Amino acid sequence: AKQRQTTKSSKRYRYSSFKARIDDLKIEPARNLEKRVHDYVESSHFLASFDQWKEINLSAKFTEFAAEIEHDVQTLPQILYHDKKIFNSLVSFINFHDEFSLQPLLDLLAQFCHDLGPDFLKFYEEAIKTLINLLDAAIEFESSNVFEWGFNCLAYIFKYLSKFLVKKLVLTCDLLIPLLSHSKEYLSRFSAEALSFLVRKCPVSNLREFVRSVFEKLETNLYEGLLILFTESMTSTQETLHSKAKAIMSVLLHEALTKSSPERSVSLLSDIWMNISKYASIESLLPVYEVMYQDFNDSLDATNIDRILKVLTTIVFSESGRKIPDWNKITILIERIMSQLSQDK
Amino acid sequence: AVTIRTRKVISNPLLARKQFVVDVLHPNRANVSKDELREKLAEVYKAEKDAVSVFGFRTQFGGGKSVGFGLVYNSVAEAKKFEPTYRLVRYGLAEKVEKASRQQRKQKKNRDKKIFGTGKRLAKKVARRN
Amino acid sequence: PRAAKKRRPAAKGKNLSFK
Amino acid sequence: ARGPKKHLKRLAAPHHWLLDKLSGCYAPRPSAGPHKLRESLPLIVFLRNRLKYALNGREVKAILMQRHVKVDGKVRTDTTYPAGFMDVITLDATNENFRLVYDVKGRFAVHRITDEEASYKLGKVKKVQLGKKGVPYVVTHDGRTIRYPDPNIKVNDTVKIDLASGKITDFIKFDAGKLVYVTGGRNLGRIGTIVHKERHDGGFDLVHIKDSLDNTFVTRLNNVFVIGEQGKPYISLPKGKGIK
Amino acid sequence: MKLNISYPVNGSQKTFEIDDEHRIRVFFDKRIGQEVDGEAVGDEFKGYVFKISGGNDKQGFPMKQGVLLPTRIKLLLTKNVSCYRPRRDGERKRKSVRGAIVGPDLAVLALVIVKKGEQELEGLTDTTVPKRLGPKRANNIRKFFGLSKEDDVRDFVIRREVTKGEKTYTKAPKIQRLVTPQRLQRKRHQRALKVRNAQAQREAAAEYAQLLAKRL
RNA sequence: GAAACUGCGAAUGGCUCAUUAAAUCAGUUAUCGUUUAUUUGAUAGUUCCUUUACUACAUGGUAUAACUGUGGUAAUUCUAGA
RNA sequence: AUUCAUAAUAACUUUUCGAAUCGCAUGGCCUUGUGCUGGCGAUGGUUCAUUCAAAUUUCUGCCCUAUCAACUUUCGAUGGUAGGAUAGUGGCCUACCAUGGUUUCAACGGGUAACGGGGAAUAAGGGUUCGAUUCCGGAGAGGGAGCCUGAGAAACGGCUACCA
Ligand SMILES: [Mg+2]
Ligand SMILES: [Mg+2]
Ligand SMILES: [Mg+2]
Ligand SMILES: [Mg+2]
Ligand SMILES: [Mg+2]
Ligand SMILES: [Mg+2]
Ligand SMILES: [Mg+2]
Ligand SMILES: [Mg+2]
Ligand SMILES: [Mg+2]
Ligand SMILES: [Mg+2]
Ligand SMILES: [Mg+2]
Ligand SMILES: [Mg+2]
Ligand SMILES: [Mg+2]
Ligand SMILES: [Mg+2]
Ligand SMILES: [Mg+2]
Ligand SMILES: [Mg+2]
C-alpha cells in the first residue's frame, strides 16, 4: 500500500489485483504503437476488423451477432444503406454485458463510427449512453480489460468525430458528467483523459465557451475530474508540456480571474498549476510563465485583487521556488497588488 | 517466386493465438529464412512480426518444399507472456541469461550446503585463529 | 436430447507470393 | 516398494489414452481424485492429445493457471486431475462444453454438448447408507456424497445431479428394459437395453444386454451404467449410438 | 586454563589466561551449576561469585550437563539437546562429550558472575553491550513501556535509524498479534458462516421430513 | 530479499539378481480381518448453568534460531558460554 | 449373511476437537460513532465416504534327486481356551491343556552356473532350450543385528553396535 511494486521480482508470472491493473491503466490510444488491423483496408474499416474478430473470438454472443450482420457489411454502400440496423444490433449485444464478447463488439462500434463519421452523429447520443451504462455495469464485475476496451472505444469515437464534437464540446462534456463526477476515482480519471484529447484539439474561441460552462458547474467529484482533465491536456511527454498548453492556460486564467466565475474555479487553477509545475521541467514552463505574468499585469483590478493573489501564492509555493525562472517579476507584481484585500492571503 | 500456404488453422483463445501448419514452396532456392517468414506472415495476418513465431521447418526430400508449424499471437504482449523463453531469445524479444555451466553451479551449491548460516562468524573466527 | 451442433471452422487457409 | 508410487511408465499406462510409445519414457500419472487411475483421463492428455489446444506440458500448465478450464462447474488447476466418465469439461473462452463418454472403440471421445445439457451430469449410485445423526446419503461412482436422498434410490440406480447445487433432480431405477451404457470389459462403450439380471449370491451378478441391432451380450453388473429409458436417453449420445 | 567470564547484567564477557595452578585447583572437583568465590581464585576477583556454566577440553570436546564423570564418554544425542544440531529430522548421533566434573584436562572454563565483588573488572563490569533487538508483539511492547490498555502500541514502536550515504531513514518492526479491523472482519465472517451453515442444514432437514411425510 | 525457524519432500526415481523350490511369481478370491499422508464430496450455532472479583477490539515464555559478542580443537555439514 | 449402518441410557478419560491464522478489496445501513454489517480467496480442523496405496489372504500351477523313507514335536510341532502384542486375523508370543500335523498321489532332506512372469529361438505337429537385460511384481544396498523420524522405512546418497 505505502510502497508500490517498484522493484520487480525475477518471476515471469506475477499476481496483480484488479485495483493494481486499474492504477497503471491510462486511456490514450494514440500512445499505443502496435499494428492496427483497421490500418489496412480493402472495403471498409468495419469489414477489416469484423473479419479479424470472427477468426479470433468464439464467444456465444459475438458469433450470434456476426451471423445477423454478416450479410449487410460486405461492401461500404451496404453498410451505409443498412447503418440503422447495424447500430441497433451493436447496441443490443453490448447491452448483454457479456465479458467474453465485449472486446470485438466495442472495437467494431468504434470502427463503425470510423466508416461513416458525419452520419454517425445521429447515433452519437445513443452510443455514449450505452457505453456509460456498460461502464457503470462494469463496476460490479471487476475486469480491468473491460474498462480498457470501453474507454478506448470512447476515445476512438472522439478521434473520428473530433471536428464535430469540438464545435459542441460542452454538449459532449454534458453527457460524461456522471462519469466525470462518479464516486469512483478512476472512472472520472479515465473519462477525463478521453475528454482531454478533445480539449487540446479545441479552438481557443470554442474553448472559452467550454471553460465558462464547466466553471459554471462548479459553483460531487466534479472538482477532481476537471483537475485531471486540464492537467492531462497540458501534459504531453515527460518533463514537457503540450504546445496548446499556453493557450489553454490563458483561457483558463482569464475566466478564473473574471468576476462572474466562482472562487472554486480559481482554486482549480491553483491545483492545475501545481500539477503541471512538477510534471514539466524549467524550460517548458517558460512560455506558460510569461502568459501568467502578462495576464496578471493586464487584468489586475480591485474586484479580482484577491484572486490574482491566490494564484500567485500557488506559484511561489509550487515545488518551493525551483520552477520559477526570474523572480524580480513577482517582486514587481506584488508591488502592484499592494499599490492597488484579504490580510491572511 | 516463393509461395506460403497456411493450413489446419486452429484458433486458440485459451492461449490467445492462431496455430497452423505452414507450407513453403521455394523452387530454385535452397530454403527460406525464418525472419522473412515471420515478416510475411505478420503482413498477412495483419499482426506484428514480434507476435509471429515459426519453427520445425523440414525441407522435403529433393528440395523445392518445406513444412513446419507457425503461431500468430493476438498481441505482442500475449506472445511475450506465453512463448517459450528460448524462442523469445531466437527472435530477440528476450535477452539470453548468462549462467555458469551445470557442474559449476552444482559445486557451488554443495559448497554452500556445507556452510551453516551467513558464515561471517566463521570468517572472523578463522581470521582471529590465523 | 440432441448434442450441440458442430461449428464450421472459424479460420481458413490463406496465401501470397513474393520475389 | 516402501510407499505409494509417483511415476508411471508409458508402456504401463492405460492403452485407451493412445500415448505414443516413442515420445518419451514416462506418462502422466493421474493424481488422486473422483475416478480410479485406470478409468480416468488426466486433463493434460485431454487438452494436448485429444483437443490439441496445447503443444506441450508447459502450455497445458499455462492454460490451467489462467483458470480457463472448469470440471463439473469447478475450476481445476492440476495438470493430472483425473477427469472421468460422465464428467463435464467446460472451456468458456472457446464456448465449448464436453462430456466424457467412451466410443464404440472403447476410448474417451471428444463429444460436444450444449450448455443446457452441460448443466447436469449422471451418477451411478454405488452405495446408500445412514450417516451420523441418522442422515441418509448416497455415494455415486464419482465420489460425490449427497445427503437427504429420495428413499426409493437404491444401489445401481442412476441419479441426475445438478452441477450448480450438487443435488438430485431425478433418478432412474435399475430394471429390465432400461437403457444401459457399458463402462468395462471388452464390450466397453456399447449401448443396449437390459433383458435379465442373473443374480448369484456371494458372487458377481451378470446382466444380459440387447442392442438395437438385436445382438445380445452378457456383462458383469459392475460395468453397467443406467442412462435412461429405451429410445429416450437422458444424455446426448456420441456418434454411432454405441452400436457394434 | 583460560577462563571465559561473562557478566550477563551488562551483557559483557572477556577471557583471562591462567598460569598459577592453585586457582585452577580451587576450580577442580566442582560441577556445572555450582558456585565458587572469586577471592579463592585471585585478588582481582575478590568478593565475586562465579557460577560454572560449561567449557571445552584440550581436544575441543565440550562439557555437558547431566553426566557426572571426569572423563569423556560417547553419548547418543538427540533433538533439543546441547552439543548437537540434528541435520535431518529424527536423527540421533553418538558423539564424544566431556563430563560435567571439572578437571586438569579442561582447556577453557566458562563462568558467569552471579555477584559483583569489591573491585571492578576492567573489561566486564565497566563496559556494557546494548540489546540487539526490541520487542515485537503488542503485549511485549506494552510490558516494555508499561503502556495502559487505552494507549496504542502504534506510537511506542522502537525505531532504528539507518544512514546509507547521504540518505537516512527509520525502520520499525511489523507488530504481530495487533488488533486491526481486518481481524474483526475475519471473526465476524467466520461467525456468520457458521450461522448460515446451521440454517441451511435445518432447511434441508425440514425439506427431507416434508418429502417423507408426502411419501407416507 | 541473503540467513534461519516452520511446512512438505527426501519411503518416488535409478541399479543388481546375492538369498529364495508352494517361497517369490501367474491367473483367481476375501477383508463381516485392518491402517491409509494426499486428492475429491459432504460434515461441527451446544442459550444457560453462583467468586461477573470477568482478556476475546485476541493470552504467556512455562523460548529459541537466524543475529551481536567471548572461545576450544590438528582436523569434520563439530560446537560451548553470555 | 452379522454383535452391520445408525440411535439411546449410565458413568469413564495425565484425553482430543469445536479457527487467538493469512492475502486482495472497501461495498451496505444508519441514531455520525475510528458504530453495526459485508465481498473474493489462501491455510488449517473432527467424522464419514472416495482415490492413490499398504498388510494379510482363498483355489491351482515350479527344474534334478528314492543309493534322501519316514518327518515335525525336549528349545511350538497340530489344535482348544484365556491373556499379551499388533492397525488388525492368527501359536505371532505367553500360561494351562490334550497329541496331534505331513508322507510312495514322493513328505522330510540334498543340488541348482534358481529372482518369477509377460516373452525369445527352433520345430510340420507334438516337444526341447533360453529369459541378468527396455514392462509388471519380489529382495538388496560389504555381512549380520537393532532403531529415531514420519501416513508411509526395519531406509542405508538416515542413525547405533559387532565382523572384514
Ligand atoms: Mg461380496
Ligand atoms: Mg525442518
Ligand atoms: Mg532345498
Ligand atoms: Mg501358495
Ligand atoms: Mg502434498
Ligand atoms: Mg541463551
Ligand atoms: Mg486371541
Ligand atoms: Mg508355551
Ligand atoms: Mg542365484
Ligand atoms: Mg527375467
Ligand atoms: Mg524392475
Ligand atoms: Mg529395501
Ligand atoms: Mg561392492
Ligand atoms: Mg538396513
Ligand atoms: Mg552410494
Ligand atoms: Mg536410496
The runs of H, that is alpha helices, within chain B are 34-45, 76-82, 85-91, 102-114, 120-129
Alpha-carbon distance A74 to A46, whole Å? 10
Alpha-carbon distance A295 to A316, whole Å? 17
Phi, psi angles (nearest 5°) of residue E34: -80, 165
Based on its alpha-carbon atoms, the radius of gyration of chain A, rounded to whole angstroms, reads 23
Q: Does D239 touch chain E (CB under 8 A)?
A: no
Say how many CA atoms lie within 13 Å of A259 toward its Cβ.
Answer: 6
What's the grid cell of residue D210?
Answer: 440387447
Interatomic CA–C1' length for residue E36 and nucleotide F77, angstroms: 38
How far does the centroid of ligand 11 lie from the alpha carbon of residue D44, in Å? 27
Alpha-carbon distance D69 to D43, whole Å? 9
What's the grid cell of residue A15?
Answer: 499476481
Strands annotated E in chain A? 235-237, 240-241
Report long-range pairs for A337-345 (Cβ below 8 Å, ≥24 apart): A337/A300, A337/A305, A337/A308, A337/A309, A337/A312, A340/A300, A340/A301, A340/A302, A340/A305, A341/A305, A341/A306, A341/A309, A342/A306, A342/A309, A345/A306, A345/A309, A345/A310, A345/A313
Phi, psi angles (nearest 5°) of residue A103: -60, -50
Contact A109, A161 (CB under 8 A): no
Give the end-to-end CA distance of chain B in Å, rounded to a whole number. Answer: 78
**Residue with the three cell numbers 463503425:** A112
Contact D148, D136 (CB under 8 A): yes
**Short-list E173, E134, E175, E125, CA closest to E152:** E175
The CA distances from residue E141 to A13, E129, E136, E137, E146, in Å, are 39, 21, 7, 6, 8
Edge-to-edge order in the sheet of strand E35-37: E12-16, E2-7, E106-115, E49-57, E35-37
What's the grid cell of residue D125?
Answer: 449410485
The CA distances from residue D15 to B34, D10, D20, D98, E157, in Å, are 39, 9, 10, 22, 66
Where are the domains positioned within chain B?
Answer: 3-113
Domain covering E131-216 in this structure, CATH number: 1.20.5.2650
| Residue D130 host element (H or E) | strand D120-130
**Residue with the three cell numbers 508409458:** D10
DSSP per residue, A151-173: HHHHHHHHHHTHHHHHHTHHHHH
Alpha-carbon distance E103 to E68, whole Å? 12
* Beta strands at E12-16 and E2-7: parallel, antiparallel or unpaired: antiparallel
> Strand, helix or coil at B67?
strand
The CA distances from residue B96 to B84, B87, E159, in Å, are 12, 11, 43
Considering only the C-alpha atoms of chain C, give the largest distance between any 2 of them, rounded to a whole number of Å. 56
Alpha-carbon distance A308 to D51, whole Å? 71
Alpha-carbon distance E114 to E49, whole Å? 5
Where are the domains positioned within chain E?
Answer: 1-130, 131-216
How far does the centroid of ligand 9 lie from the alpha carbon of residue D3, in Å? 27
What's the grid cell of residue E101?
Answer: 566434573
* Beta strands at D96-102 and D88-91: parallel, antiparallel or unpaired: antiparallel
- Sign, CA dihedral E60-E64-E69-E73, equals negative
Q: Kindly state the DSSP code that residue E45 receives in the 8-state scheme.
A: G
Alpha-carbon distance A311 to A257, whole Å? 9
How far does the centroid of ligand 10 lie from the alpha carbon of residue D3, in Å? 24
Contact A35, B46 (CB under 8 A): yes
Q: Kindly state the DSSP code that residue D49 receives in the 8-state scheme.
A: I
Contact D92, D127 (CB under 8 A): no
> Strand, helix or coil at B99?
coil
Neighbour count for residue E164 (Cβ, 10 Å) = 7
Residue E15 beta carbon within 7 A of nucleic strand F: yes
The CA distances from residue A187 to A148, A150, E16, in Å, are 11, 11, 74
| Smallest CA–CA distance from C9 into chain A, residue | A55
Interatomic CA–C1' length for residue D1 and nucleotide G68, angstroms: 40
Edge-to-edge order in the sheet of strand D136-140: D145-147, D136-140, D120-130, D158-162, D167-172
Contacting residues of D for B84, CB less than 8 Å apart: 58
Burial class, E146, CB count within 10 angstroms (exposed 0-12 / middle 13-18 / buried 19+): exposed
Alpha-carbon distance E16 to E45, whole Å? 11
How far does the centroid of ligand 16 lie from the alpha carbon of residue B105, in Å? 24
Q: Which amino acid is at D216?
A: T
**Residue with the three cell numbers 463496476:** A139
Q: Kindly state the DSSP code that residue D47 receives in the 8-state scheme.
A: I
Alpha-carbon distance D212 to D241, whole Å? 9
Do residue C11 and residue A58 have CB atoms under 8 angstroms apart? no
Resolution in angstroms comes to 3.9
Q: Kindly state the DSSP code that residue D98 receives in the 8-state scheme.
A: E
Q: Which structural domains are found in chain D, ordered by start?
A: 1-116 (3.10.290.10), 121-171 (2.40.50.740), 174-244 (2.30.30.30)
Alpha-carbon distance B3 to C16, whole Å? 6
Residue of D63, D95, D96 to mutate for A, most A C-beta atoms under 10 A: D95
**Residue with the three cell numbers 445439457:** D117
| Residue D137 host element (H or E) | strand D136-140
Q: Kindly state the DSSP code that residue E101 receives in the 8-state scheme.
A: B
Alpha-carbon distance D133 to E66, whole Å? 55
Query: Which ligand has the shortest distance to the CA of E88?
Result: 2
Burial class, A221, CB count within 10 angstroms (exposed 0-12 / middle 13-18 / buried 19+): middle
Contact B67, B58 (CB under 8 A): yes
Q: Which amino acid is at E85?
A: R
Phi, psi angles (nearest 5°) of residue D64: -65, -45
- Sign, CA dihedral D9-D11-D17-D18, equals positive
What's the grid cell of residue D206?
Answer: 451378470
Alpha-carbon distance D39 to D104, whole Å? 16
Cα-based angle D108, D113, D119 (whole degrees, multiple of 5): 110
Contact D237, D211 (CB under 8 A): no
Contact E174, E181 (CB under 8 A): no
Enumerate the nucleotides of strand F whose atoms come under 7 Å of any protein CB: 1-4, 9-14, 29-30, 37-46, 57-61, 66-82
Neighbour count for residue B106 (Cβ, 10 Å) = 11
Give the end-to-end CA distance of chain E in Å, rounded to a whole number. Answer: 96
Neighbours of chain C (3+ CB pairs under 8 A): A, B, D
Domain covering B3-113 in this structure, CATH number: 3.30.70.3370
- Sign, CA dihedral A148-A153-A156-A162, equals negative
Q: List the beta bridge partners of residue E37.
A: E49
Neighbour count for residue D93 (Cβ, 10 Å) = 19
Based on its alpha-carbon atoms, the radius of gyration of chain D, rounded to whole angstroms, reads 19
Cα-based angle B15, D98, D154 (whole degrees, multiple of 5): 140
* Beta strands at E93-97 and E49-57: parallel, antiparallel or unpaired: unpaired
| Residue D139 host element (H or E) | strand D136-140
**CA E186 to chain CA centroid, nearest Å:** 33
> Strand, helix or coil at A264?
helix
Neighbour count for residue D212 (Cβ, 10 Å) = 13
The CA distances from residue A27 to A275, D85, E156, in Å, are 19, 48, 44
Alpha-carbon distance D148 to D130, whole Å? 10
**Short-list A103, A112, A101, CA closest to A151:** A103
If DSSP states are collapsed to H, E and C, what string results for A103-140?
HHHHHHHHHHHHHCCHHHHHHHHHHHHHHHHHHHHHCC
Residue of A55, A59, A98 to mutate for D, most D C-beta atoms under 10 A: A59
The CA distances from residue B3 to A42, A316, A322, in Å, are 22, 69, 63
> Strand, helix or coil at D42?
strand
What's the grid cell of residue C7?
Answer: 461449428
Neighbour count for residue A35 (Cβ, 10 Å) = 17
Q: Kindly state the DSSP code that residue E165 receives in the 8-state scheme.
A: T
Q: How far is B16 from chain A (nearest CA, A)?
A: 8
What's the grid cell of residue E168?
Answer: 537516512
Q: Which nucleotide is nearest to E90 (CA to C1')?
A: G149
Enumerate the nucleotides of strand G whose atoms come under 7 Å of any protein CB: 5-7, 19, 21-27, 34-35, 37-41, 47-54, 134-139, 148-156, 158-161
Alpha-carbon distance A55 to B19, whole Å? 12
Alpha-carbon distance A189 to A23, whole Å? 10
